[PDB]
Amino acid sequence: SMKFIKYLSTAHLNYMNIAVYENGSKIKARVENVVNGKSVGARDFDSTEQLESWFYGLPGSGLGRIENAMNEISRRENP
Amino acid sequence: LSTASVLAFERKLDPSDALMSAGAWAQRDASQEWPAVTVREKSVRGTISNRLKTKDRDPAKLDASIQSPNLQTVDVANLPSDADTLKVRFTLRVLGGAGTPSACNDAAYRDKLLQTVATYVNDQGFAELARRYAHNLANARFLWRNRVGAEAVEVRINHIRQGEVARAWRFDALAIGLRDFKADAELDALAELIASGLSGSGHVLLEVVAFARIGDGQEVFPSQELILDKGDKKGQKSKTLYSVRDAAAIHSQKIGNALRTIDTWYPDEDGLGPIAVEPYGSVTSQGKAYRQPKQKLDFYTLLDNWVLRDEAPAVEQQHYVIANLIRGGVFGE
Amino acid sequence: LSTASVLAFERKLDPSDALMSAGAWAQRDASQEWPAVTVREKSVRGTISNRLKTKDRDPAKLDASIQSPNLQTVDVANLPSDADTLKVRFTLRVLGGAGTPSACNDAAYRDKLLQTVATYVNDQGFAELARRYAHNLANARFLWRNRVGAEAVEVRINHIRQGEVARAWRFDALAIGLRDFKADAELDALAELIASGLSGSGHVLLEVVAFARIGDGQEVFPSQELILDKGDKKGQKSKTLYSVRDAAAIHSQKIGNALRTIDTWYPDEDGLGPIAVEPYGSVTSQGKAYRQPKQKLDFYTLLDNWVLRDEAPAVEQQHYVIANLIRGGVFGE
């Protein structure tokens, strides 16, 4: 049960974007290929306010900022 | 007596990386100096027009996916806006004696293959295979997508002995057809020259110059550099073209594959045109498994039948086998 | 019969990149020498204009934002201060053979698609589609924002048979409408030239030149490039315009999009007008995808009905499917 909310950008980059799912009281951000749904990395979040404070805290402006977001999520999170 | 298991037939009729330049038609005669076509850069904003599911996908998700653009970045290459002719120049070593390999276990199989290749050199030197290679040189098979849409394609083929010329042919690739193979006196002469050049009679080195009116500013098609992209490292970039030192080039593999379209007797069809000559012979783009191994018409099982059981099908299948050994490759697993 | 897992179509009506240059009206007859419009660079200090979140609607936060710098650097392209018109030229190849895919797996789906496009062509030619493409050449759709607010626009189209021009046309892009499709003698002659080109019965090479009398020093609009404003040193220029050597250019795909703005039977309305031909036909610049696959007008739906099940749609949707095949694309799963 992961209800879709919105894509994180206005434009897709290379058929790649960040989808936003509501996973219970948490909230999900998956790096997905838009034509077939293959995820290449996700990260857990809880509130949309802190998610936007994290996203707008990234360096960049627009598609460069979501490039930074997909490079951040698309690496393996360290133990 | 069994046959050798580790075998390596080697490359023969090796072409060079074809370099592309650009100039004007009818001034192509005194042209050795044309500036190289180079790979430029541009950006693309497109929609999403690929097929989309109706199962396990939300309606809001596909509404948000179609209505949002795709901003990728691609490479292109064009002619200049005052130059309407794509010149393609490459060289072609013709070595000689593609029968024996240089990787053999069994000495009895190796000189047995020497016996049968000396038999084929004895009864008739390379004639119809040389016809088909000279005719693929005659039209513009090495111009892959550069061919279609052009109004005038010329092929000029010179031969090398020293710092001088030996023969200067001139082939009209529009007048010379694409599908039905014929023979003409210049084509007889070129097929005879490389017929000597195939049976180990010496050294033959050619260089081929092509020209094609397309129109000023139009798209040329150099080959595409590959990348894996399996999962991670998705990328902002797509369509990486192939280059050399500051020029747009075509791979040696694909111009050689353009030279190696010979087989008109593959068992699936015989009127659709020839296919590529290889063991388990089937073109990559179609994906249909032509030349199924469960018949006797491979290179694998047919060579195993032809070198042990000492029988033979009709002569065209032997032309296919001799084209397999001129091609090269691996025999056995 | 099942459709193939790999389909592909090369594009017809492929243009080149436009080349912009400026000069004077009533001198456009001798215009082979006009200097090209260059992309210069200026500095911009912005302002606070976007919608506030209403949690930041304080006095002190707005005053700090107004005291904050918003300095940027952008590209602009203007005419020279004595030039009042814009010359735009490009060439256009018309290939023909617009039913044959360039890649397919199923040999039965291939032949069924061939006789389906063949019985379309036998039922009616390319005359309506070429009429609409001759309209989008006649008016100045490829002048996207350059047309908007122009004194007078004029389009010259030549047919290039050899090194010498064979057939000429002279149009008026403002009197010829942007909203409907009409008939005229020179329009029907150009439409028959395009229709002969699309049916493989000739080689058509068209160069198109457009003149737009705007004003002295006004801002022309070359196509804009994709740049990723990431965290490099101090921020770079935030607006890159596409160019070539010493010339501001429009992309080829922007002109190709402006040629295929044909579709008037998306099921929403006739109040808007013609949109671009597209699978899941989507005007992304207004965020709405017309011709949704939830109705029965999607291109993949019409293809899978009219090729597999052999049920024909309305003639207007047949024009839509054949314009999609002329467009090219990556079709199949």
UniProtKB/Swiss-Prot annotation, chains B, C:
Q: What happens when the gene is disrupted?
A: Mutants lose phage DMS3 infection-dependent inhibition of biofilm formation while there is normal biofilm formation in the absence of phage infection. Decreased production of crRNA in the presence or absence of phage. Disruption of the entire Y.pestis-subtype CRISPR region disrupts crRNA production but does not alter phage resistance (possibly OLNs PA14_33350 to PA14_33310, and the flanking CRISPR loci), indicating this CRISPR is not involved in phage resistance.
Arranged from A to Z, the UniProt key words for this protein are: Antiviral defense
Q: Which GO terms of type biological process are on file?
A: defense response to virus
Question: Which Pfam families does the record match to this protein?
Answer: Cas_Csy3
Q: Which InterPro entries match?
A: CRISPR-assoc_prot_Csy3
**Nucleus among the record's keywords?**
no
Per its database record, what is this protein's job? CRISPR (clustered regularly interspaced short palindromic repeat) is an adaptive immune system that provides protection against mobile genetic elements (viruses, transposable elements and conjugative plasmids). CRISPR clusters contain sequences complementary to antecedent mobile elements and target invading nucleic acids. CRISPR clusters are transcribed and processed into CRISPR RNA (crRNA). Cas3 and Cascade participate in CRISPR interference, the third stage of CRISPR immunity (Potential). Involved in crRNA production or stability.
Self-association and partners: Part of the Csy ribonucleoprotein complex with a probable stoichiometry of Csy1(1),Csy2(1),Csy3(6),Cas6/Csy4(1)-crRNA(1). A Csy3(6),Cas6/Csy4(1)-crRNA(1) subcomplex is also formed.
What further fact does the record state? In this bacteria, Y.pestis-subtype CRISPRs do not confer resistance to phage DMS3 or MP22, but instead are required for DMS3 infection-dependent inhibition of biofilm formation and possibly motility.
**Record's family?**
Belongs to the CRISPR-associated Csy3 family.
- Stated name of the protein: CRISPR-associated protein Csy3
Q: Which organism is it from?
A: Pseudomonas aeruginosa (strain UCBPP-PA14)
Q: Gene for this protein?
A: csy3
